[PDB]
Symmetry: C5
């Protein structure tokens, strides 16, 4: 059972860590059909998505996808520094699997 | 697989982008029957709705409609700048499909 | 499709607008059986309730009732100014149908 | 239909009102099995619980129990003053039925 | 019922109290399949998890697990002082059973 985001990220294929150490620059969310997703950017130009729930996700990820969008919204609004994102790099924008926040 | 609200908005019929770059001026919410909806305005006089869930919405949009009203409420209370709205222009008030928040 | 709370309120019988332009003075919440409700007051004494869900409510109102109590609690804690309430005046306390926040 | 927490409390057997007019001193919450509950204390030592959902509860109370634990947490974190609690007397700690918050 | 986290903790096998009296240093959460979990750390090096929901959990614990991750995120973002954690010490990182917050 992993002790940090880097070790967690390494348990999966097609992932990587992006280190941001910065607040979120913009937060976007959509209710449009088949694009029920969130998109965040950072001032360095990096863009990430929380994917639309799909057949790629198992049932236990459903609640966590919803939570992640909650987390990104409040992080954005509080200007919380994002340390790292673990992302799947076989999607464009890279798809968020995990987030760490630290000052 | 869009990277921003403008490219997302462009995937749908009967939509357009409004650029606000302003905080929400007023936030209204109703629990009355058949009008379970939210309405927001900006100081420029613009009015937008989150529509009552209906037959025009597929299942996956229902959860995202609830999220959007949560987003608008907290955006309003924190005086967060709304960058852009993607809206359907075949409804009055124009109906929100997506929001971006920046600055 | 309503442009504002006054127009929305006018679509229903037994309603009226109260214009408060003030923050909520007190917030009360109960989980007692058959009294699962919220009550708010303003400094002048005017009292309003979010009614216990009952057979007068259609299914779509259930989520909106829960949303309204969430809204009143955060409005209270943030000292947000309530502009207007649309209420049913065939109940005591008058029962909230919609709320507008501005200023 | 009660105007305030004192009148609501008086509708029930084994209840009493505690007048605190003070912020929550401590907030405790548990996910351990059969102890899925919250406990709060005030600086005077008075201690209160939100009971684990049980056969004493009716269905309409389930969502309100969850809401009450939400309210207690955010009240604690914002240092909001608690005016009164209506509690059941026949449990230790006394079990919260209702809360009022006021300036 | 228990009046405090220490008494609550002692009701269970394989638990202990950690006394932190410090804000959370880092907050991590994951939506990756089979690792839908949260991890927190403190400046003293201590690391804790909210376990992925599984067969060891009774159904009533499920909502409480989701609540705990909510609480840890907001505690982190508000820099709220964590007093104590009750944990299962038969897991690595130690698994959170309960939390107490006090200033």
């Amino acid at each position: 059972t992993p002790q940090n985001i880097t070790d967690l990220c390494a348990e999966y294929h097609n992932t990587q860590i992006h280190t941001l150490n910065d607040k979120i620059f913009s937060y976007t969310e959509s209710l449009a059909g088949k694009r029920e997703m969130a998109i965040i950017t950072f001032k360095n130009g990096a863009t990430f998505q929380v994917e639309v729930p799909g057949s790629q996700h198992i049932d236990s990820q459903k609640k966590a996808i919803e939570r992640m969008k909650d987390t990104l919204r409040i992080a954005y609004l509080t200007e919380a520094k994002v340390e790292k994102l673990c992302v799947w790099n076989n999607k464009t924008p890279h798809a968020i699997a995990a987030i760490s926040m630290a000052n």
